Amino acid sequence: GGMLRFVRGNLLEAPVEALVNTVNTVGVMGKGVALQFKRAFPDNYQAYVKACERGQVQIGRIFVYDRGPLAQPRYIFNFPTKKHWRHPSRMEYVEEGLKDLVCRIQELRVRSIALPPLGAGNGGLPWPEVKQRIQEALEALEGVEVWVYEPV
Numbered sequence: 001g002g003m004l005r006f007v008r009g010n011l012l013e014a015p016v017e018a019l020v021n022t023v024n025t026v027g028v029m030g031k032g033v034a035l036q037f038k039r040a041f042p043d044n045y046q047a048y049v050k051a052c053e054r055g056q057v058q059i060g061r062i063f064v065y066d067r068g069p070l071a072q073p074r075y076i077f078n079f080p081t082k083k084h085w086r087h088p089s090r091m092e093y094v095e096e097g098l099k100d101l102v103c104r105i106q107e108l109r110v111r112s113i114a115l116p117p118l119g120a121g122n123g124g125l126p127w128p129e130v131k132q133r134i135q136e137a138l139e140a141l142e143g144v145e146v147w148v149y150e151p152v
């Protein structure tokens, strides 16, 4: 039927198939969640740098790294919440990106996934608006467990 869950803790130790990373489109993961993802998942990071180098990372597209069929998590979903790191996030970026998140979850038969507060740290977006978008987008999903890490 589906299940969406608000939790506290550290996203990167979520017991899930797919992890959502918050990225920009300019090829650096210099702070926040993205810095932790660079440290925790170096291979994902190199692949992101390469994808940025092409022109392949843009707003409204998740950049997926497959860590292998025996990897847990198996997927890093690099979610663009910024264009340049110098500028804030925008609600639109989160709306467009959620739409692509839903597609790829289905396409990849992703059964469980965890996210942070998209755009609400270095992006400056109000959490309550971000949450709603996340709820409307993702509780819809059938046979997918969703873990959402609320801030404080």
Ligand SMILES: Nc1ncnc2c1ncn2[C@@H]1O[C@H](COP(=O)(O)OP(=O)(O)OC[C@H]2O[C@@H](O)[C@H](O)[C@@H]2O)[C@@H](O)[C@H]1O
Pocket: 009, 010, 011, 012, 022, 023, 024, 028, 029, 030, 031, 032, 033, 034, 035, 036, 081, 082, 084, 085, 089, 116, 117, 118, 119, 120, 121, 122, 123, 124, 149, 150, 151, 152
């Ligand atoms: N380990 C963690 N687990 C769960 N939540 C976390 C963790 N670390 C941080 N957070 C929460 O996630 C929020 C979002 O982190 P940001 O990195 O600020 O994400 P965002 O606001 O989308 O900014 C994107 C920009 O910052 C970099 O991450 C990225 O390279 C991009 O340029 C933070 O404000 C914080 O509340």
Ligand SMILES: [Cl-]
Pocket: 024, 028, 029, 030, 031, 085
């Ligand atoms: Cl950054």
